[PDB]
Design a protein around this ligand. Structure first.
Ligand SMILES: *C[C@@H](NC(=O)C(=C)NC(=O)c1csc(-c2cccnc2)n1)C(=O)OC
Lengths: 166, 167
């Protein structure tokens, strides 16, 4: 893709399901002034590590204290995202989210981030840390079966912010 | 570069400084049959998170229990690697190593792994997890100032091994 450490992170404009439960078209450039953790997950309604999304959401406060924004994304439609959020966790849904979920139905954001699994038209489990100036600082890509750690992501964000203070 | 999840990891043949302190030419394909953690660090004698190298070395036993091999690499010469190893830790050295350190002086391995900082001729802090069949499972790339966690790396290796055995 076009994701390079130390270069501007690839911009995107996309329909997201926002924390209030409404659709909104958002761009990554809207979040300039804040650290962004931008992560991909393969499919809505997946039985494979859906709880990572819930964990990022549940621990949003810890990212807020770091003046950082968390954004999830998959190739599913904004309507799929909404359905999943409107499904209670007791029934296997996400429930209400503290983070926006981006829809990448053209697969072009995944392609720009270099995380498209082309033979399936879904994203790998990519995660990217972008600084407050929009510069890409960290690339994480897991094969489909293994999820991400919120603790590791918080460590990375802190460490980048600490080293920025120098 | 050519590192793609679900595809054979780019092979390399390179001079390493081995744990016994001797040079040896090794290939990544030598390690088929084991999980490999292959990581890059920018420069020998760096003041920026050199301790991660020592941590991977000190905790080699935990990687052994996972039947996994850890290999470090930088663009510096094998001679530089050994000098750093032979520098006492209290003087800013690595001390004795339980892992091989690969030399990538042509910058071709860094380039193959997509972690060459072209404007500088050093590698970013890349880390790669390759399975026992040689297939790349995980890509990690940090900008220069931020190091890697051994605990996170162990989590990933074991998790990939567990999910290999059972969906
Ligand atoms: C969805 C969830 N899946 C797994 O964690 C999985 C298959 N994990 C493991 O096999 C595993 C081995 S050791 C380990 C661990 C995690 C956290 C703390 N200590 C050990 N997990 C996932 O990956 O979401 C994070």
């Amino acid at each position: 893709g076009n994701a390079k450490i130390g270069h501007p992170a690839p911009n995107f404009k996309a329909t997201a399901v926002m924390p209030d439960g409404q659709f909104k078209d958002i761009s990554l450039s809207d979040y300039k002034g804040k650290y962004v953790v931008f992560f991909f997950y393969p499919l809505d309604f997946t039985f494979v590590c859906p709880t990572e999304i819930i964990a990022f959401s549940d621990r949003a406060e810890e990212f807020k204290k770091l003046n950082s924004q968390v954004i999830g994304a998959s190739v599913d439609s904004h309507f799929s995202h909404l359905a999943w959020v409107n499904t209670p966790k007791k029934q296997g849904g996400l429930g209400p989210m503290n983070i926006p979920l981006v829809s990448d139905p053209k697969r072009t954001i995944a392609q720009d981030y270099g995380v498209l699994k082309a033979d399936e038209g879904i994203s790998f489990r990519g995660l990217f840390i972008i600084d407050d100036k929009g510069i890409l600082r960290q690339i994480t890509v897991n094969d489909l079966p293994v999820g991400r750690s919120v603790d590791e992501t918080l460590r990375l964000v802190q460490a980048f912010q600490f080293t920025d203070k120098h």
